[PDB]
Nucleic acid binder design. Structure first.
Lengths: 156, 156
DNA sequence: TGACCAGCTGGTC
DNA sequence: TGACCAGCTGGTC
């Protein structure tokens, strides 16, 4: 047993209270897939994760779907994408806007919206690379946070 | 923003503390790869995670390297392994022991432990397949909890 | 920065 | 309970 365990138990009833809120807003595990940071983004913007979605997909009060990515700036400078990118994956995202949220560790700093139109420069490079490489799966290429800031439009 | 956000503003400080607490134990993010859930197992078992660590692996006061898995018994009935199971991986597992934490949501009910002797039954079946499958990687072959509760030592 | 490398896991017939 | 479907990121340079 570790001395800090006494501290963990003091906070728990508050953690469980947080996890009860996420649950109420469609999220099941706050300790996975950025589960806990999303709920923040969802409550601030007002988007909605729906029952039975694949990945972090969200919808507004009108049907529009969006793709959410989240990054911790104390650690990296490029948003992650997919561990096995290829045309098929790009197609899923192609038509929908993306929402990118930026955290200083666990504290939220900004939320930037990006139009598909702006994300085209990137889908090209990837698809193009794919071919000119032997139809081999790019391993998590990254989107620069700086690019997102200059090209996106800050909504928080 | 959504009215529930206000409720989220009351619980926040209590959340940052957990994060400050996780960061004191080698956890950079409590909302990913089971950070929160992993903090728990650590303070209980008194295990330690070493920087430049490979995933979610801890050591004891004697350098014995371990592998830690987590699971929500309330929605899936088998532990995950690797998205691309293969001989390279397997040959880094059979060398070390696995701790298994069980939760009912985010509430640990137990912690069993397994020796490489116990797990052999599975690696024998996986190399077997990969070698005649056509060296085709195995995507997240699960290990049944029942198997775990019935072949290991209860640690908690 | 581009291109390298890796990690946590959940759902189903 | 096997053998398939799939998701979220990070790290050295």
């Amino acid at each position: 047993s570790h001395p800090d365990l006494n501290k963990l138990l003091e906070l728990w009833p508050h953690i469980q209270e947080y996890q009860d809120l996420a649950l109420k807003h469609g999220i099941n595990d706050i300790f996975q897939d950025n589960g806990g940071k999303l709920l923040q983004v969802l409550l601030i913007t007002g988007l909605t994760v729906l029952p039975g979605r694949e990945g972090n997909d969200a919808v507004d009060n009108a049907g529009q779907e969006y793709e959410l990515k989240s990054i911790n700036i104390d650690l990296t400078k490029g948003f992650s994408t997919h561990h096995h990118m290829n045309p098929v994956i790009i197609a899923k995202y192609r038509q929908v806007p993306w929402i990118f949220a930026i955290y200083r560790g666990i504290a939220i700093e900004a939320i930037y919206r990006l139009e598909p139109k702006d994300l085209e420069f990137y889908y090209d490079k990837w698809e193009r690379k794919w071919y000119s490489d032997g139809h081999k799966d790019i391993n998590n290429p990254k989107i620069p946070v700086k690019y997102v800031m200059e090209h996106g439009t800050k909504i928080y």
